Each structure stands twice: as C-alpha cells, then as structure tokens.
Subunit: 164 residues, 2 copies
Amino acid sequence: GWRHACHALLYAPDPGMLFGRIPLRYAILMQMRFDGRLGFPGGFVDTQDRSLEDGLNRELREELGEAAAAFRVERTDYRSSHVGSGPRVVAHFYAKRLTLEELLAVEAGATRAKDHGLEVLGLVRVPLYTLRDGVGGLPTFLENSFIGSAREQLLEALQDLGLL
Amino acid sequence: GWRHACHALLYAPDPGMLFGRIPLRYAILMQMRFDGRLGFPGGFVDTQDRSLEDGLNRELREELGEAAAAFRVERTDYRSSHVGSGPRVVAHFYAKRLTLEELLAVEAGATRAKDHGLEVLGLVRVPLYTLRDGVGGLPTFLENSFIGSAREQLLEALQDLGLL
C-alpha cells in the first residue's frame, strides 16, 4: 500500500543583498500547488513505470516547462528519503545545483509550463534570512501551508548548506 | 504618525477548468513578500511625496516590471481602506481588471522586475475553488501567512465578485 513521491530542490548561489545588507546566499525554488500548499516541484511516481528519476523528471517537465528540460535530475542528485505520519508515502528528496542564470531561466519559463495556472499557481523563492523582529523571513515563511515532507526537505538542505 | 500603504488586486476573467471540471473563474495575483508573507502588489506611500495612485503605480512598476506599465491603476479603481491590529498603517485597496492576456504578460515578465528575488519572492494565483475534501484550495490558501490587510482585501474582492 506504499506510494512513492519525488521532489526536487533546485538552488543556485546568489550574491544578492536584501536592502543592500542582508545576504540572500542562495536562491531556492518552491512551487505553490493548486491546493494552496507550498512544496518542492515533483509528485507521485509510479515505480512500476521506469525509475524514480524518470518519474521526477516527468513531473518537472509538466510543472516547470521546457526551460527546465535542460536541467535533468540524475541519481547523483539524490539526497535522502522521508516517511511522515499520515498515509503510507515515501518521499524522495533530490537537490539540483544550478547557476543563478539557469535558475532565472527556470523561473522565466515556468509561465509557459503546461501546469501554469492549473496544477501550479506560481513559483516562489525561499527567504533564508530572519528579519530584525526575529519573526519575518524564514520563520514566517515556515508558518505557511506546506506539502507533506517539504519542510523536512528544506531544513535538511539548509543544514547541508551550512546555514542551519 | 500614521503611515499610508496602497495595494492592488489585479484580476482577469479565466474560463479555464482545473482537471477540466473545476471552474477557475478568475486569475487573481498575489505576491510572496520578502518577509515570507503573501500580499497584494504595492507598498508604503509618502503622502506629500506624490499622490496615492502615483505611489501605487510606482511600487507596481518596481515589483512587477514593465508589463505593469501597460496599464495604470486609477483613482476610480479605489475600493476601500483598512486599519488592522498593527499599529499603525492605513492600507488603501485598489482593484484593477485586466484581460487574461494582460495578466499573463505581467506574470511572464515578473522575473525581470527590479524587485524580483529581493522585495518580491514570486507571484502566485489565488485558488478560488474548494476541492472535494472541502479543505484543499481556497480554505488552505487562507491558512497561509498574510501581510496586514491582505486577507481582508482578498475576502472583500471575493464577495464583490460574488464568489462567496
């Protein structure tokens, strides 16, 4: 009764400075899904059909569009897997490093994706900083509604990037 | 001591159908802001600095890009104002009807806006429908983090559009 899902964290180094003083340090992409939840691009895969990577890339093509096709996710991009508590779902986390130019191309092409304005409501970047009040930024972002396993995938990546 | 802010709800009729069966009824744009909260495009205005509408259209250009220059939010687009818990800001709500083509153009050019990846983390459409579980869609979207007055502006618009 176990189902499998794959999700891709696309990221790029970013030298931008919010208000000219807060280092962004990385652009990381999330999608707002049709159900009103934020998560990483991807979804369920039929592991009877091909492999985990084929399933993931299939989903990304529909959600991100042709512009994302040049940046296929491979086995070496696999990071970890996760089981929560609700239904019997194993989520598989992939991280894909892009240049910021490439990540911008993904963002720019997303409006032409088959899913734009349908299964995908839009893309957003994750604010990695915390603002002066100790609440604005990442902590408030994390109070939004998320797809199962998305919070865990993000926090793992932030640890991996030495931002913990 | 009070500050003024202006926000614009940009919307267009959308005949699209999610899963070919759920009427979208309208594309309505929101922004994910740098503080991790959803809001409508716009920001603080300096009152003796310009005008309420001049201040708004200025902010829209920085946040959305040149595609926003294809239209102007006018005095007649004003809907109502709002004061929240705060303190201490008075938010002025404007609603601007676009064609779907115009709205798509705004989305498509957003990554080239001055504020992209800085003050604005990305645009999303509001899901106006409620899924079969009675939770997914609008009800879940409404559980996200919102900037002061944004939830109120949205709900007012939805009732105005007779979508409630």
